[PDB]
Amino acid sequence: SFQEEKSKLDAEVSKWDDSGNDIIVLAKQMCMIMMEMTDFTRGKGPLKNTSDVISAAKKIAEAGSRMDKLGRTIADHCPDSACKQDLLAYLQRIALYCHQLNICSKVKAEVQNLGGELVVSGVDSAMSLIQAAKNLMNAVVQTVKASYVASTKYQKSQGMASLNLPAVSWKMKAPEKKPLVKREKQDETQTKIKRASQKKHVNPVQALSEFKAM
């Protein structure tokens, strides 16, 4: 029965040939670029110096412009509801972050070219671009989820045809089961200062991996 389930690969691997025509694939490429930029901080990735970060910032900004266009054209046809307002809000956020990335990258490039590499020799100059990139990625994850919900809510309405809606070509996996009982530890005697548990944030790699294709 192993042979016939290779169609899962063929269905899944065939989503990467659209060349920027689907929301999820563009968001995934965004995520890969942002992961590269984040890993640059530890110096363990393809990016080796500042100019690589500048090029990555320009690429992710162009991707952000394309994502904003797609989000707008998918949000226009949806009838006014609670889902549309969230989509518009995250679209505005994406526009702001993309503009910030573009201008900051240009300024950093000019500073490096003018004062030399020693001016931006410390890695502290690139933290601004990384912060903008991760803010943009969080906004993109939020708008992708909102767009999927809006598309699956109003997929029977007029004007939704001839659109590669994520509710048609993609399906969302059900969330995992929460733990019934909180894990008990020996931390009571190890440390003597109880502290509020730090809230876990959604990693943009995970929230996008939970989309499945047919």
């Binding site: 505005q92 956020r93 526009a95 995992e176 089961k177 929460k178 003597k192 502290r195």
Partner: protein, 371 residues
């Protein structure tokens, strides 16, 4: 296909699929709105945050609870939470999933009628059903005879059941739960010089209670050992790095469950509320009710609450008889687990409230069927 099981309480919201063994979505039941001026363009479009995302941005929001004392008071915010758990948490379409709801006993009738109206008209579910929280706790305990003490965030009630038969005249409901203990702790903490007045700061105090409070076996003796020494002191670290210290307030806050006069309530403690409920039952079934005493809800999670209850009951009941306390480790989710058992049951598949019956009867259909 799968039938949703949503258990919405005063503090938390639990939802999942019937037949499973654990919920798939647990988030706080709060809705927050911004209270500060927005200066950066495009960042102020969002005007309401629901659930976990509202909890992460407490610093710029005003948190409100749509449900208080087990009664829904803001029907606009409640629809916001129900939409959040159907699309952003379970990722399901409500049009093909009958849902099961829960509600505390001795609750206004208008609460469940308007709850049913929203489900059928707004979300368009095929069927639904509303059950009693205390009854569902017995399903999860693998029993059919016992008295259930359920204490959540807004209401504490007792329901005795014998051989699957309820005794409505012996049901006692007391409006004293965890949210009232949080408010008392804030007032008590001011003696040491700490002040928390913001709604966002009430969430900090709630977390302090869940990590440092406990029930003392003997209150009078414990107070003596608190003043003489400093061995009961523990420290908690605030989000901004400040460190606070708690003395005898650790066991003074949960003591109001057994001494409601601390808050000013005239009612009796939870220990002799159960005894009064038992003594209002028939003399023949009191033997099986003293045993099989089931505790449920997050408020009953304090260390030593089970041992303290047994000591207080034994002093009231006749010495010849035996008193047992059942405190499962997962009692914080007992209500939901019982709901999953009931919804997936084969014999239960005929007593749903189908949309056809709602058409010819309206919201009043729930009283004659759901009970």
């Amino acid at each position: 296909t799968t039938a949703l099981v949503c258990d919405n309480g005063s503090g938390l919201v639990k939802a999942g699929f019937a037949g499973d063994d654990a919920p798939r979505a647990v988030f706080p039941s709060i809705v927050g709105r911004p209270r500060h001026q927005g200066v950066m363009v495009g960042m102020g479009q969002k005007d309401s945050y629901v659930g976990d995302e509202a909890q992460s941005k407490r610093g710029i929001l005003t948190l409100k609870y749509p449900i208080e004392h087990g009664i829904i008071t803001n029907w606009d915010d409640m629809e916001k939470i129900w939409h959040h758990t159907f699309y952003n948490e379970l990722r399901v379409a409500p049009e093909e999933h009958p849902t099961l709801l829960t509600e505390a006993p001795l609750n206004p009738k208008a609460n469940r009628e308007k709850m049913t109206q929203i489900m059928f008209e707004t979300f368009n579910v095929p069927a639904m059903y509303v059950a009693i929280q205390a009854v569902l706790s017995l399903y999860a305990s693998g029993r059919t005879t016992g008295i259930v003490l359920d204490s959540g965030d807004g209401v504490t009630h007792n329901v005795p059941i014998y051989e699957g038969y309820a005794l409505p005249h012996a049901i006692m409901r007391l409006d004293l739960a965890g949210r009232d203990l949080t408010d008392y702790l804030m007032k008590i903490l001011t003696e040491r010089g700490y002040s928390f007045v913001t709604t966002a700061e009430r969430e900090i105090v709630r977390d302090i209670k869940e990590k440092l409070c406990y029930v003392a076996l003997d209150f009078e003796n414990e107070m003596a050992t608190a003043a003489s020494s400093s061995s009961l002191e523990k420290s908690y670290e605030l989000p901004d790095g400040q460190v606070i210290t708690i003395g005898n307030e650790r066991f003074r806050c949960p003591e109001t469950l057994f001494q409601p006069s601390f808050i000013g309530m005239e009612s009796a403690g939870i220990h002799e509320t159960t005894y009064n409920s038992i003594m209002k039952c028939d003399i023949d079934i009191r033997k099986d009710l003293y045993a099989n005493n089931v505790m449920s809800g997050g408020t009953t999670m304090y260390p030593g609450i089970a041992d303290r209850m047994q000591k207080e009951i034994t002093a009231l009941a006749p010495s010849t008889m035996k008193i047992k306390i059942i405190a499962p480790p997962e009692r914080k989710y007992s209500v939901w687990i019982g709901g999953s058992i009931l919804a997936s049951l084969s014999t239960f598949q005929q007593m749903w409230i189908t949309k056809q019956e709602y058409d010819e009867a309206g919201p009043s259909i729930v009283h004659r069927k759901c009970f």
